[PDB]
Structure 1
Amino acid sequence: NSVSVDLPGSMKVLVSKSSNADGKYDLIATVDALELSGTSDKNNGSGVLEGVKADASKVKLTISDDLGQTTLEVFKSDGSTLVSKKVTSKDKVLGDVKFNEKGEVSEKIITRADGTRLEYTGIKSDGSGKAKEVLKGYVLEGTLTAEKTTLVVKEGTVTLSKNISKSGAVSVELNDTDSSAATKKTAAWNSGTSTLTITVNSKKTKDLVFTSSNTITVQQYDSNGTSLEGSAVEITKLDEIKNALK
């Protein structure tokens, strides 16, 4: 009769064992308390399903085999003004979009495959908003623009900026308003090694690595800056990042 198929999210779609006379498969999905039904040309679980909420909100679930992506849309009663959109991509990144009363984006949470998050709130029509990154053990705060996300960590005269481009590319820069040549920090960034090298007084002092694990490590140079010493230490607290900027 029917066969069940597991879906990204905690969702399941029951699909017809065989296609009807028009070549199509019947799809039934239960998503939380919602019952959704639809059709598809394939037997694997891809397709589009629709349902209605108790309060007349319209719901649409789209499963795209070509991208392995599942999109759950909740609309107002018109079926067009968006209330919420949840997208799980095939690499298990989650996007959780909230809309204002005119159906425009106002918030988005991106959850990475490891569970760290980018939280965008107060999003405006120009693509600007407040940004926050939720890492393991600490949170980075900053701003969103249509050009980039900028998370900032300040320590005295030093500002560390972690930038995430619209395409997702990371860069880091260090700005120090200290004007004494003996103490002012400057820094150079390498995207390929994901490393910020901090210099003071023409001597390297430490490398900050921004790991593909979404962690930060710090490794000291010797006091003459001629060599890295010891081994890199993974940051676990915001206090430790600020300490690195003293």
Structure 2
Amino acid sequence: NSVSVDLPGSMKVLVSKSSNADGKYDLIATVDALELSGTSDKNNGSGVLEGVKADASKVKLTISDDLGQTTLEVFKSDGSTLVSKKVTSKDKSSTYEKFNEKGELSEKKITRADKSSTYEKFNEKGELSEKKITRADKSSTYEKFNEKGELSEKKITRADKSSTYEKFNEKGEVSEKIITRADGTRLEYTGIKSDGSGKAKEVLKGYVLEGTLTAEKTTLVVKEGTVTLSKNISKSGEVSVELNDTDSSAATKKTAAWNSGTSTLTITVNSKKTKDLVFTSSNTITVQQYDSNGTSLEGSAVEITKLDEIKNALK
């Protein structure tokens, strides 16, 4: 009875095999579970189809004469005031627009055949409030603007899904910064001052470490008893670790040395190695004990999944 035709925009149109009572072919398509209908002079699938939502919104599909382009418009019941408009080309490039209660543009997304896109939102004044550019490798830049058109926030996402997000104050200074690594862990910096110093939080799997940011380095700090562990992170992200114990007793005091070749901190008390804390490439920490002679590692390294286990290692 019908021939199904595939169109730009993952749409399908059904064309009657036979002409109807007139010199015309009947067209039906379902878009978002609303059936649209029309009639055309041609039997290729081109034409205009229309339907009406339950709430009296008018939906109009226009398929170009050569099937090179489809336009799908949703209007208010007046049939003129736009609610949304989607234009797709055969080469899979599209333009999707949403409109506010006035029928003025409020969002626009333009997608190219390679899947890169640009997205803009406009405020109730027709001013740009957000913009996101996504590249073919899936890297992106995202910007948000305030009412003065000043940059309020920016996020740069790399192809490996690592990212740097910044919030800016009215002096144009970074007040907050979040660095997300490709492993998914994050460094969060808040309260950034004019000298580039602030509070620092490292968000790891199962726990969070807290410390401070200077222009020189981030330092995260875990304290247990008289022992303090400091994880330093350089600007380029290199981790080094140190341990200080205030214990004055030669019998009990911990000291540690860091091997940056193995990313391992080895703790000694009373002349024997006691444990090795390895800071792995996936930003996790493992711990393994030396046998009571302090000269060989025993058992197996254990991956730390909670903050209490790091404290327990510093006992």
| Counterparts of 1:209 and 1:37, CA distance in 2 | 67
**Larger CA deviation: 68-77 vs 191-200:** 68-77
Q: 1:180 to 1:104 in 2, by over 3 A?
A: same
Q: Given the two structures, how large is their TM-score scaled by the length of structure 2?
A: 0.48
Q: Deviation at 1:169?
A: 1.5
Counting only pairs closer than 5 Å after superposition, residues 12-91 of structure 1 correspond to structure 2 as: none
- Partner deviation per Cα, 1:20-39 (whole Å, 9 max, x = no partner): 99999999999999999999
CA drift of 1:236 comes to: 0.3
Compute the displacement of 1:231 (Å). 1.1
Distance (Å, rounded) in 2 between the aligned partners of 1:167 and 1:122: 21
Q: 1:157 to 1:16 in 2, by over 3 A?
A: farther
Q: For the residues of structure 2 that align with 1:140 and 1:117, how far apart are their CA atoms?
A: 11
List per-residue Cα deviations over 1:194-233 (Å, max 9, x = no partner): 0000000110000000000110000000111021001100
* Equivalent pair of 2:62/2:71 in contact (CA under 8 Å): yes
Distance 1:39 1:109 in 2: 56
Shift in alpha-carbon separation, 1:231–1:159, aligned structure 2, 3 A: same
Work out whether residues 63 and 70 of structure 1, in 8 Å CA contact, stay in contact via their aligned partners in 2.
Answer: yes
Structure 2's unaligned 5+ residue stretches are: 93-166
CA contact (8 A) 2:45 2:67 kept: no
Would the alpha carbon gap of residues 103 and 222 (structure 1) be closer, same or farther in structure 2, given more than 3 Å must change? same
TM-score by length of 1: 0.61
After superposition, what is the alpha-carbon deviation per residue over 1:113-136, rounded to whole angstroms, capped at 9, x for unaligned? 121100000111111000000000
Change (3 A) 1:53 1:68: same
After superposition, give the CA deviation of every residue in 1:128-156 in whole Å (9 maximum; x if it has no partner). 00000000000000000000000000001
Cα deviation for residue 167 of structure 1 reads 2.2
Computing the radius of gyration over CA atoms, which structure comes out larger, 1 or 2? 2
Indicate conservation of the 8 Å contact 2:188/2:202, yes or no.
yes
Superposition deviation, residue 192 in structure 1: 1.5
Structure 1, unaligned runs of 5 or more? 93-97
| Residues 113/223 of structure 1: CA separation in 2 closer, same or farther (3 Å cut) | same
- 1:40: Cα distance to partner? 39
Distance, in Å, in 1 between the alignment partners of 2:259 and 2:37 is 50
CA separation of 1:181 and 1:114: change in aligned 2, threshold 3 A = same
Shift of 1:54: 29
Alpha-carbon displacement from aligned partner over 1:42-92 (angstroms, at most 9, x marks no partner): 999999999999999999999999999999999999999999999999999
Runs of 4+ in 1 over 6 A off after TM superposition: 1-92
The count of corresponding residues between Structure 1 and Structure 2 is 241
Change (3 A) 1:126 1:137: same
Which residue in 1 is equivalent to 2:116?
none
Contact residue 83 and residue 99 of structure 1 kept, 8 A: no
Indicate the structure whose relative CO is greater, using CA pairs within 8 Å and at least 6 residues apart: 1
Q: Tell me, what secondary structure is at the counterpart of 2:286?
A: strand
**Structure 2 CA distance for aligned equivalents of residues 167 and 22 of structure 1:** 74
Q: Is the 8 A contact 2:46 2:67 kept in 1?
A: no
Q: Assess if the C-alpha contact under 8 Å between 1:25 and 1:40 holds in 2.
A: yes
